Design a protein around this ligand. Structure first.
Ligand code: A1E1G
Ligand code: A1E1G
Ligand code: A1E1G
Ligand code: A1E1G
Lengths: 321, 319, 319, 325
């Protein structure tokens, strides 16, 4: 039968007999994502351009406000880390719950003007310390995630939710404002045919990345070369990696020596989705999910996707170390 | 002062003292684009998955454009990426314009929710002969109007005509295309290059060297960034709004490239030239190619003029 | 073949060879009505209740209609139930039409969610002098177009002009008005009567007797049914669609009626007459009343012609 | 703090420490209501009129039938119901054993039939009981008096879409925001006015009125104490008329006459849910002889008379009615 996000989570949440708090958190997040989607699709833009006479908020800020407010009022969270905010937000005591959430409310906003995909990325942790809530509660390794995923505001809006039972994909039906389950227990292809990275950094690449990409374009075994795709929005590039397989790279380069993407709310959520889908995600040195963060906005290199492709890259990496 | 597409084009048409047929055409096209956008955003998908107890999206998109244009009384010949032969409008509905379109561009990848789009070019029928595919075999220089709809994070219609390029954002709350950027011009030189570098082994030597200069600039300037969505509408629109260069050039598998002249290259080349950019095959302007087959391919390199001219310098060096 | 409000008006306008101003006006009204419908259905209400951490609807609806009509370049004088004096369009946006409208008919009503609507009447400015409130003082016989949008279970625009009455359903998936009922004609005689019987104490004897004939018919037919929503657009639209009669008569506690002649009675009378119905004050056709004040009231009895004639027979008895 | 139907119900239930089955039921009901609302507002009607050339024709079902299919399918798949009674089908629907939950639902999927083509308000009425018999579930489990209701209410598809939900604590109203498909709490713990100024019934039937009804309506048009006469409103859709009665006060009547000596409306999925909403809002609902909620049904489709609304107005009707006994 048909299933919706709310019903799917409600029913899985009744089964494993948890405190109900994660279900409440996810439902509040879903509401925020639907509201972001509506704003990203520009519903009501006519009023901004004077339809009612001579006359609000950048999408970035509004998306952050929507996630912040819905998570606060879920009574399920205590610490919230957002790409938008310099410091972690500590939820007021009367609305504090069990969970810590790191999120990027509108990934890809530097591509909004060209209208390409934007998205929301989130990662959810159980607060581990009994201390008063603080930034330190978000400094957990991605291995500690209890749920993670993203919403892609693409040609359609889809929510990908990873939990320790696997990855499930929901399509927003805007006629009824309902996320419909359309792909259950998804697994990434063992090996793909697409590679995805910004090759404009070629001058600054490590020898390992340089060699690996040369193998994709000029296969030593004379097989067909991989195709290339790079949207430049991480949700779009990672989602395509999930559904068609292949490999996504945002390595450190000489000008971003610790990486470009942010560990807490870009790399770790996507690494968790990948691993729950049977894929891999590495910094080169170690699994993304094993990095122990020290700073909430710290960066990380990331190479992720189909296991055979990531293993091949790691083989090239070991040769150059 | 707020402007919808409907109001804008009609007011422009009055000042041009036309009959109104082209305005009627564009209105019918916009209605089709709104319907494509709604289906692309998956309105009603809950019913397909059983909420109450499977045509392809680009077939439906083709049917929408075909039906809306036929019933506009403004068209006589319709060439679609979707259809083997040109469609001849029934005599009682024939108007004076010929439309070439790709109803859902980039749609072999809707599975990843990548941007998709609709591309269109509109010609005046040039002879009084009985309508046929020959009426669609005009060089892009002959275009009366061209553009695209981009179904991305939001839905946008870019409309190019003799006057220039104007961009309209679809407000889905009221189904109006609102004018948001007027008389758009591309920047003289950009900092993004866009092509499928997985073809690298088969590149023409000039393409190899040009792309090498983007990554390793001989003057030690900043390397260009790379973007390649693999959807023509998305890649061209980014080129328009940010500047830079987009390439689908000729080589081995493809002495004529791979994109199609009538409903991919020509509409995009026309938008580009009206916005102050360029679009070349490497040997000529795209808009100067006289087609002989409605599905014929053309190489295309387009975008900011300084970038396209720099590509042509490397191209001549290898010629 | 499918048709839309925009395409229907535009093809009808190009045919008639008028100045195009009426087409521009109706398109601007279309846009305003879709924006009102969106707001009436409470799109975005979550933001009012703090989802991210200010006008009432009647005011917003007035602003939408006023702004969109002004920017149509088709109007010169605008009369709204919301504004004490007529609005004079500034010289650089002036066209030749006068519009009287009720931007959101239904007031003691929004809070209980029953149907509301927008009513409009479009008169042509005869004179050649500077426009003023006096130009809106014209009989309904000078209407060139009139109708209403009903925001009910669905949103419908009913448009009457000299060719007759046509009904368009708003498809909110694509934000387009779809032609669904062409050349509408009201039933010759209906079976429903519609008025507020709470005024029975103050009813004129002719109204009292007519209503008794509906409840106890002199020929032993079945009694009429009664329906009274209390929103004029809803009651009149039901009258048009199912037949019957609608009454807001002069009671002794207000001898000129309650409803306003210019932007409630006249537009509805015009729709009715163009659909083969009738609309009377009791003494004369609503459309023949010559107003002396833009907000003057008039009694109205309208609907199926045999039903209005039967009321008039009773009315002439009490003389 | 903003509140949605889902979150509001979720946390009221945790306070009551229920199983969560009722919350699950209500969530699935809300999904059906959103789908009904989208169809009633005519989303996609352009495809019915040939926008894509008439190759694309659900969609073609009448709204009545679609609405029943939507409610039936979402309640079945909720895993919260065992017996479902709809106006549409002669017999009660018994949920497949695999999907069986503990609740019984009686509903009117799209109240207002002679009424869609003129675009008047339509709506969805529902009443929710707990199964009590230990037997295999059967039609008999729906034959409970309105007093046993766990929850009831309606969706009104009017100028906007509103869900009114009554439970033993009281009545709450949620506005559907169609931009995001969320029911927003806009009016909490709603109470009806003690006495109103509007009366609601089909006066075209006057020839067939009970003399008690005739007298009462005469009293509202020509008050004996020389007070202002009441205003009259009759939409002809029960959900619209009852919602107006709830919001503005007054009285709504569908009493016994000639075409129907037992009234016209159906007890299980029209009269009882509105009677439960009214009583939870401080109002009344009588057949004339007894409370609607105290009628013990023997037939899932039996009719009942109903007079409901502001308590002072209903009491006054009852005094006239007793005087004609
Ligand atoms: O990998 C997968 C798939 N794991 C399952 C996903 C998951 C697990 C645990 C939770 S949980 O921690 O939040 N636990 C509750 O939800 N427990 C509860 C127990 C009893 C009733 C209710 C309830 C009541 C009313 C409405 C909704 C639910 C909730 C949430 C999600
Ligand atoms: C920037 C630019 O190139 N603008 C011109 C775009 C354009 C649009 C449409 C046409 S058209 O051939 O379709 N003609 C019209 O739209 N004509 C028109 C519109 C509105 C009103 C009237 C009119 C004129 C005179 C009397 C009554 C009505 C005509 C051409 C160019
Ligand atoms: C059934 C009925 O009553 N039909 C008459 C409807 C009608 C609509 C509009 C007009 S008009 O006075 O506004 N005149 C025009 O619209 N004239 C016109 C001439 C040429 C071109 C155009 C046009 C319209 C739309 C887009 C482009 C060009 C309009 C009169 C009667
Ligand atoms: C006004 C009024 O009467 N409110 C009560 C409404 C109500 C709604 C739903 C139910 S229920 O039977 O379905 N039970 C729940 O919803 N229970 C519930 C919700 C959320 C979380 C938890 C929970 C409790 C303990 C541990 C984990 C999770 C339970 C009852 C009354």
């Amino acid at each position: 039968d048909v299933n919706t996000l709310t019903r799917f989570v409600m029913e899985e949440g009744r089964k494993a007999r948890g405190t109900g708090e994660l279900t409440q958190l996810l439902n509040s997040l879903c509401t925020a994502v639907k509201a972001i989607s509506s704003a990203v699709r520009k519903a009501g833009i006519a009023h901004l351009y004077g339809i009612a006479g001579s006359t609000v908020k950048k999408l970035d800020v509004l998306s952050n406000d929507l996630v912040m407010n819905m998570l606060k009022s879920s009574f399920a969270t205590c610490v919230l880390v957002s790409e938008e905010d310099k410091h972690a937000i500590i939820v007021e005591p009367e609305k504090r719950g069990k969970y810590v959430v790191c999120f990027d409310p509108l990934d890809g906003s530097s591509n909004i003007d060209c209208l390409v995909s934007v998205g929301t990325i989130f990662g959810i942790y159980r607060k581990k310390s009994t201390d008063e809530p603080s930034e330190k509660d978000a400094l957990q390794p991605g291995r500690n995630l209890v749920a993670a995923g993203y919403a892609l505001y693409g040609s359609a809006t889809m929510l990908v939710l990873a939990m320790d039972c696997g990855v499930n994909c929901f399509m927003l039906d805007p006629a009824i404002g309902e996320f419909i389950l359309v792909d259950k227990d998804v697994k990434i292809k063992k090996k793909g045919k697409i590679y995805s990275l910004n090759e404009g950094y070629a001058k600054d690449f490590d020898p390992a990345v340089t060699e690996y990409i040369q193998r994709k374009k000029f296969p030593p075994d004379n097989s067909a070369p991989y195709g290339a795709r790079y949207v430049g929005s991480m949700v779009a590039d990672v989602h395509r990696t999930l559904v068609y397989g292949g490999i996504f790279l945002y390595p450190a380069n000489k000008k971003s020596p610790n990486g470009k993407l942010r560990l807490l709310y870009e790399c770790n959520p996507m690494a968790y989705v990948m691993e729950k889908a049977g894929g891999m995600a590495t910094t080169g040195k170690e699994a993304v999910l094993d990095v122990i963060p020290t700073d909430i906005h710290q960066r990380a290199p990331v190479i992720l996707g189909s296991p055979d492709d990531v293993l091949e890259f790691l083989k090239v990496y070991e040769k150059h170390s």
